[PDB]
RNA sequence: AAAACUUUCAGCAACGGAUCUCUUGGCUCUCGCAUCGAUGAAGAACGCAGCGAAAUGCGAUACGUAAUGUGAAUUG
RNA sequence: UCUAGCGAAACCACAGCCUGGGGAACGGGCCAGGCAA
RNA sequence: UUGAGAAGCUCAGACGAGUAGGCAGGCGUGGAGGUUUGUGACGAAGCCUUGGGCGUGAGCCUGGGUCGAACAGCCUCUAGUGCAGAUCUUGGUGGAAGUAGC
RNA sequence: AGAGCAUAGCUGUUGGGACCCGAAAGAUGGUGAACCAUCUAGUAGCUGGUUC
RNA sequence: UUUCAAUGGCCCGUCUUGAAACACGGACCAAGGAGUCUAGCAUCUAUGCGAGUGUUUGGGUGAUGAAAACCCAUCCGCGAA
RNA sequence: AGCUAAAUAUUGGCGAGAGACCGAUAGCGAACAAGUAGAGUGAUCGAAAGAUGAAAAGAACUUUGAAAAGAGAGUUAAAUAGUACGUGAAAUUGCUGAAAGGGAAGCAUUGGAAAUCAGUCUUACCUGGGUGAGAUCAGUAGUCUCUCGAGACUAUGCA
């Protein structure tokens, strides 16, 4: 399967895919939007806050706050799948960030939604040698 | 006699920008109350015979040559005596095999090839 | 050119005949040539394939490699050749199929019926 | 399966059969888990046996691959070759010259600069006139060069690199791919003039050793550690990958040693595929073929030559 | 005179062809090796898989640190720092 | 004024199933021939396979037997 | 009432500050205007 | 002086709105007989693309990317031959809308 | 000190389902006032559309 | 090509109305989609023959599609009066 | 009061040969489970639905997950052919990059800017000599096909 991100080869990344998931498309898009760019462990804690009603996902494009749990539950497995796929590669866990996420419309058979997630690393090497 | 054109921009169909079911191919607007057909200000132009180019320059590329479509290597040979006015256009489906035969023959013949660097690759 | 009105020249009708043919009509559609020295020995050109016939593949990825015909798979017009196999995912061997008009028959399985067939078509052993 | 021609039937037949295939695959996985958690030795033996296959493991057997034990015959042959002056006590310093094809453009002139960036002490002379490659190599022999690199560019895209070893060394002809400039690399860095540190990996076969040997001859023998610039040449399924990086070590928990370096790509970044190795200066027609790849034979993806 | 006129032009125009054929042969003009759409695609796909199975960053990582472990440098290189060299000393002993 | 939001354009991924290629189908014309049933027809239902989902085939002699051939395959 | 979960149909050229005059409505687009964040 | 596709080439002058309507020349699609000793796995047809051109225009030729088995220029023959509408037929898809709500 | 006849085309006209779409039908024969099937391409000065 | 700057330009088709005003039809995209086939008549032009004219009802024939092509007997039609 | 062949009809039945015919919204209502599902008390009505690849080689195995599935990995010429399978258009939606964004947008002219392509070419000609050549040239010798000489050559010398 070919993803939508120029990264996510074996460089520093692991993937995960969801196909025809039985969740409302609009909810998944808003859930995906807020968690993009956050740390992987930070995103896990935030998702727990949503379950515990400590934090609410903003609704920007599809409008304010809400506490969906089904869409977050779908994302929990994908993120768990994401780190499980990271381990198989053997990456550096403590620096995982959610580099990419995308929710796409599915066949109209309930409105399902494909979900993809890409975890990555942030690095900087000092040049020195001045 | 230089290659000078009375207009560069193409003639687009009226309202062809708004719709997508409407094609950009120029169609004469026959609408009875069509003000754009009526040649008002701020409207678009319309093809007229007044827009024709010089008859000694029609079909002429900006460098002065008229494109001539050569299918095989037989066709590139008959441009032996019009190499100063015609340029051997290579057909789009001519394979890379005969495409080199056409370009090497045309180079020695003295004629100009327009798409001589397609599907091929040089090696030194 | 065909001249008989008993024969047809139809892509639709001839393909209907080819893939609508039963096994006793498919046994002639699956014929094989004979090796040049054996072809002239019996003075016959081509004979229908048969189990336990020693053949050599002439075309395809398996060109040249010889063998016998373990079983003739009539319903898809294929010949199953021993040791001419393919490595599946699970390490087993899914033997590829070769069409009967590609291989060449080197050593026939001499049955009583085959001998009569040879001498029936103006041939001899 | 495929026997029944109706479209909607064969979908229902597959989906029913697919669900059944997943169901019994579930129960055999579960009972395997139940018995493996009961006896950890069963898990140990399964892991030590059920190693997934890979192209490298399923590679076809060829006899040219050298063993880990260094063979004396190889060293006897390679101690007096063309590049031996760079490997003997002479320690020749190699100077490089980079040229282009006849009347090329400015695309190469902004990629050959990146090439020159990774190659300190390497001149460049844009090809002018009716001079051919077999004449450049003769001229560079008396000028004081060692190897000669040409970046062929056509249709305003560079595609082939041919390099010869002066004065009569073998000539190699690679076809570049995915050549990305330093700008088109995320988190790129600015490189200095420090001498890069070569690293050559995965060149097991004999022919690959020679191609690796020539590339080693292409670099200055004395690296500058203080600049800690690294140039990587890695061969995997014949696709030689050239990359540049800057490495600074950090404390990494995952690596059992405890230390692991962060990397920042410097540019350039491109592939090569060894199209042909020639003996003598590169002549397209009248050269001697050390190796010319048959394109139909490479289709056996488990077979390699480098 | 029209008919003799056209023959002289053709003789003129054919000679220039023969001349140009000669000079081009003299010069060592480049060959034109064509491009195949099947080999280009297959090599494009086989490469992408190799990058995935090359593991560039990992391979350069582990072998470079083993080069540091073996110590191809002098007593202590200028690239390494004392904070991590202490773990180098502990690991190597 | 940036973000958010709104807008256009490009890359990429979904969505959709047009286009193109064909094709054991349809339609059209010509041609040859004469053949159902109280000796139970056409039709219907119930059965029957080493296992059939439809589908054909078959009738407790059931996806047919006898006989004449062909001569080694059926095939998930 | 809120929070989840499940979720339409109608409608749809395109829009949407007015002020006046704009002769045929003109305001929903034109010109003078202000507004316009 | 080569300028006889005499259906050619050449010279001169004036002229140019347009509904209903009349006349003329062309462009394009499927297939048909002839033809290009035509093109095609070294890539046909198709498709997308801010690549390059040609024509007043209908349209055309070509580069790149996909693509994988057919196709075309010319002279004639032929017709189920050209779409923005028909509260058009069929399929698809949005806003409305996470709304009415359950 | 006859100028037609025949074929092909073009435009025109008259019929034929007659450029396309749209008016309650009615009749025959059936099914359990209702409903179904055909005759039917029943009927229009009218309506909407009629393609480089 | 996107964008900006200055100048500009009332939604298209139909119908209505001198004209508009209008009232309609239009959520978007793809594909399908409407002077055709035939007998009669008259006209113009092209062709063959010309006081003639028209083989194809049919018969003869056609070995390589033989439903084609090729050939003509007795009438007959329309002209000639 | 009666019979009677052949010439003639034929949208059915048993077969057959073709076509300037349609090419999956077409051609039958049906290229397939087609009068089939399904609708209706009933008579009747009645669809949608073709294409992986040469070969199934249909994805072993490892791993995460309750599974479904995902990630590694494999097959293949190609997985931009993974059974939601030929090509994969438009509408339409999501992500990213870009510029723009005071109640529209929209397009047209003229440019500018950013971004990007068009195409580059002294090179050949003429003249001078030397050097080796060849021939359509020999104060030259043969064969072949044509119609003496016009070709294609085979020797031999290079004036």
From Swiss-Prot, chain A:
GO terms for cellular component: cytosol; cytosolic large ribosomal subunit; preribosome. Keywords: Cytoplasm, Ribonucleoprotein, Ribosomal protein. GO terms for molecular function: structural constituent of ribosome. The keyword Lipoprotein does not apply. It comes from the Eukaryota. Pfam families: Ribosomal_L22 (PF00237). The keyword ATP-binding does not apply. Its main location: cytoplasm. GO terms for biological process: cytoplasmic translation. It is found in: Cytoplasm. InterPro entries: Ribosomal_uL22, Ribosomal_uL22_CS, Ribosomal_uL22_euk/arc, Ribosomal_uL22_sf. There are 2 genes for uL22 in S.pombe. PANTHER family: 60S RIBOSOMAL PROTEIN L17. Component of the ribosome, a large ribonucleoprotein complex responsible for the synthesis of proteins in the cell. The small ribosomal subunit (SSU) binds messenger RNAs (mRNAs) and translates the encoded message by selecting cognate aminoacyl-transfer RNA (tRNA) molecules. The large subunit (LSU) contains the ribosomal catalytic site termed the peptidyl transferase center (PTC), which catalyzes the formation of peptide bonds, thereby polymerizing the amino acids delivered by tRNAs into a polypeptide chain. Belongs to the universal ribosomal protein uL22 family. This is Large ribosomal subunit protein uL22A. It comes from Schizosaccharomyces pombe (strain 972 / ATCC 24843) (Fission yeast). The lineage of its organism: Eukaryota, Fungi, Dikarya, Ascomycota, Taphrinomycotina. The gene is rpl1701.
Swiss-Prot record, chain B:
It holds the Pfam family Ribosomal_L32e. GO terms for molecular function: structural constituent of ribosome. GO terms for cellular component: cytosol; cytosolic large ribosomal subunit; nucleus; preribosome. CDD domains: Ribosomal_L32_L32e. The modification Phosphoserine is found at residue 74. There are 2 genes for eL32 in S.pombe. Component of the large ribosomal subunit (LSU). Mature yeast ribosomes consist of a small (40S) and a large (60S) subunit. The 40S small subunit contains 1 molecule of ribosomal RNA (18S rRNA) and at least 33 different proteins. The large 60S subunit contains 3 rRNA molecules (25S, 5.8S and 5S rRNA) and at least 46 different proteins. Component of the ribosome, a large ribonucleoprotein complex responsible for the synthesis of proteins in the cell. The small ribosomal subunit (SSU) binds messenger RNAs (mRNAs) and translates the encoded message by selecting cognate aminoacyl-transfer RNA (tRNA) molecules. The large subunit (LSU) contains the ribosomal catalytic site termed the peptidyl transferase center (PTC), which catalyzes the formation of peptide bonds, thereby polymerizing the amino acids delivered by tRNAs into a polypeptide chain. This is Large ribosomal subunit protein eL32A. It comes from Schizosaccharomyces pombe (strain 972 / ATCC 24843).
From Swiss-Prot, chain D:
GO terms for molecular function: rRNA primary transcript binding. GO terms for cellular component: nucleolus; nucleus; preribosome; preribosome, large subunit precursor; sno(s)RNA-containing ribonucleoprotein complex. GO terms for biological process: assembly of large subunit precursor of preribosome; cytosolic large ribosomal subunit assembly; maturation of 5.8S rRNA; maturation of 5.8S rRNA from tricistronic rRNA transcript (SSU-rRNA, 5.8S rRNA, LSU-rRNA); maturation of LSU-rRNA; maturation of LSU-rRNA from tricistronic rRNA transcript (SSU-rRNA, 5.8S rRNA, LSU-rRNA). Residues 16-49 are annotated as: Disordered. InterPro entries: Brix (IPR007109), IMP4/RPF1 (IPR044281). PROSITE patterns: BRIX (PS50833). This is Brix domain-containing protein C4F8.04. It comes from Schizosaccharomyces pombe (strain 972 / ATCC 24843) (Fission yeast). The lineage of its organism: Eukaryota, Fungi, Dikarya, Ascomycota, Taphrinomycotina.
Curated annotation (Swiss-Prot), chain E:
A motif (Nuclear localization signal) lies at residues 37-42. It is found in: Cytoplasm; Nucleus. Belongs to the MAK16 family. This is Protein mak16. The chain holds residues 102 to 194 of 302 of the full protein.
